[PDB]
Each structure stands twice: as structure tokens, then as C-alpha cells.
Design a protein around this ligand. Structure first.
Ligand SMILES: NC(=O)C1=CN([C@@H]2O[C@H](COP(=O)(O)OP(=O)(O)OC[C@H]3O[C@@H](n4cnc5c(N)ncnc54)[C@H](OP(=O)(O)O)[C@@H]3O)[C@@H](O)[C@H]2O)C=CC1
Ligand SMILES: Cc1cc2c(cc1C)N1C(=NC(N)=NC1(C)C)N2
Length: 217
């Protein structure tokens, strides 16, 4: 287990840390979705744009990949890295209804056959260190729990946690995040580097979101 890639994590969870009711993200809070797009797509520097030359990677488990709304499959302008034991790049792409788009997507889809550590082991390579700028863990459940595990947490840089104020009481899937300053079972101290003021979703999806940022030790 030699050196890996530093990534960050992106999640939207209620107070109970719940994230998903099976196979559809429970909330489609607009600004929330908007942040997610801008956070995982956007490169660093003035007027800099994501091309296959340079772009960010997003790593997700298969199940998350199944929960992607077909339109969001795959997340454009990002290298989509999917962790599956069973499925192949072929199988993944099968989950792309429109066959045409499906043929286009193979550019920016990768099927790792392994866990996070594996994916991070691959993105440390000389291709992936130059064509890919930042690496985001973007769910789902087991993949988050892994990210917080050694040796993955050892290169975890931030956590960009959104906070849906009216917690959904229908969440089957959860992100186990020990408070934000608790000597973890593991031995991690999450630190709220910063956190936005509460705002409320303009939409008739009138919830209330926060952009929290947490960081290890
Ligand atoms: N609100 C949010 O921020 C987000 C919400 N979600 C929600 O998360 C839920 C899904 O959570 P969850 O069930 O944990 O799904 P995961 O995304 O954790 O998928 C787990 C799958 O990843 C693969 N996998 C995991 N570890 C390894 C490994 N070491 N080696 C190889 N393959 C591996 C396996 O795929 P396989 O067995 O198929 O090979 C496994 O079943 C959905 O409800 C979704 O809506 C998802 C992302 C973000
Ligand atoms: C795949 C996927 C990953 C996510 C995600 C949505 C989708 C579809 N979210 C993430 N973080 C935050 N803050 N909000 C939302 C947009 C709900 N991670």
C-alpha cells in the first residue's frame, strides 16, 4: 500500500446524516445541486475550463451509479470513476438508456474493479496527475465509510457537507460522520474549517441548506 491520490468528499445529508432512500437521492434542492456541479466540475484559476485535457475526477460506488438519474449518467465534464466488483465498463454503460450518448460516454467512464484505495492508487499515475486535477469522493454509503477509513482518510483533504435543515425521516442510507470534533473510534478529528449561513431554497422545495466544510485533524 504505497502513496495514493488526495481527494475530497461531497455529500448532502440531513441532521441524522441520512443521504438516500434506497436508489433516489431524497432531495433535489436546486442551489445544492448547483453547488455540487460547480464544485466537482470547476478547475482552479481565472476563466479556466474543464476539457478532457484537464478536469476533475469523481469516484462513486456502483449503487450510486445506479441511482444517478439517467440524464446525470454520466456526470458531464468529469472523469466518472465507478467502483464495482462485478460490472465492467460495458455493464456500466448499459445503464445509459440513450445508446448514442452511451457511445460518447465511454471517454469519461472508468470501471475500477476494487475499493477506494484502489481507485486512489490508479489516479496517482502520471496520466491521472495531469489530465485530472482534483478527485472527489461522491458517495454512496459504503464508499463514504471507506473514505473515512485508513488508509484512505490519510489523504482525505476536505469534506464538503451540505446540511438539509428539515431532516427526511425516510432515509435508508446514511453517512456515518462523527459529529465535527469527536476523537473518532478510528482517531480522526473532523474540524469545521468553515460553514455558510443558513439559506432557504427558493423553490417549493422550501428546505434550508448549509455549506459546511470539515477537515481532518
Ligand atoms: N446525498 C448524497 O450526497 C449522495 C447520495 N447517494 C445515495 O447513496 C445510496 C447508495 O449507497 P450505497 O448502497 O452505499 O452504495 P455505494 O455507492 O456505496 O455502492 C457500493 C458498491 O460499490 C462497490 N464496491 C464497494 N467497495 C468495493 C470494493 N472494495 N471493491 C469493489 N467494488 C466495491 C460494490 O459495487 P458492486 O457490488 O455492484 O460491484 C458495492 O455494492 C443511494 O440511495 C444514493 O441516492 C449517493 C451519492 C451521494
Ligand atoms: C451522485 C450525486 C452525488 C451527490 C449529490 C447528488 C448526486 C446526484 N449531491 C452531492 N452533494 C451535495 N452537497 N448535494 C447533492 C447534489 C444532492 N453528492
Amino acid at each position: 500500500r504505497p502513496p495514493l491520490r488526495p481527494f475530497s468528499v461531497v455529500v448532502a445529508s440531513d441532521e441524522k446524516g441520512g443521504i438516500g432512500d434506497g436508489g433516489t437521492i431524497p432531495w433535489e434542492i436546486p442551489e445544492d445541486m448547483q453547488y455540487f456541479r460547480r464544485v466537482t466540475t470547476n478547475l482552479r484559476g481565472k476563466n479556466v475550463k474543464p476539457s478532457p485535457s484537464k478536469r476533475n475526477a469523481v469516484v462513486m460506488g456502483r449503487k450510486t451509479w445506479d441511482s444517478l438519474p439517467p440524464k446525470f449518467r454520466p456526470l458531464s465534464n468529469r472523469l466518472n470513476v465507478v467502483l464495482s466488483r462485478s460490472a465492467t465498463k460495458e455493464q456500466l454503460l448499459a445503464g445509459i438508456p440513450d445508446p448514442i450518448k452511451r457511445a460518447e460516454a465511454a471517454n469519461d467512464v472508468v470501471a475500477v474493479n476494487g475499493g477506494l484505495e484502489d481507485a486512489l492508487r490508479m489516479l496517482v499515475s502520471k496520466e491521472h496527475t495531469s489530465s485530472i486535477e482534483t478527485v472527489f469522493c461522491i458517495g454512496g454509503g459504503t464508499i463514504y465509510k471507506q473514505a473515512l477509513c485508513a488508509p484512505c482518510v490519510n489523504v482525505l483533504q476536505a469534506i464538503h457537507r451540505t446540511v438539509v435543515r428539515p431532516a427526511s425521516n425516510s432515509c435508508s442510507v446514511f453517512f456515518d460522520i462523527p459529529a465535527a470534533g469527536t476523537k473518532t473510534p478510528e482517531g480522526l478529528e473532523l474540524v469545521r474549517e468553515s460553514i455558510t449561513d443558513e439559506r432557504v431554497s427558493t423553490g417549493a422545495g422550501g428546505k434550508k441548506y448549509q455549506f459546511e466544510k470539515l477537515v481532518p485533524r
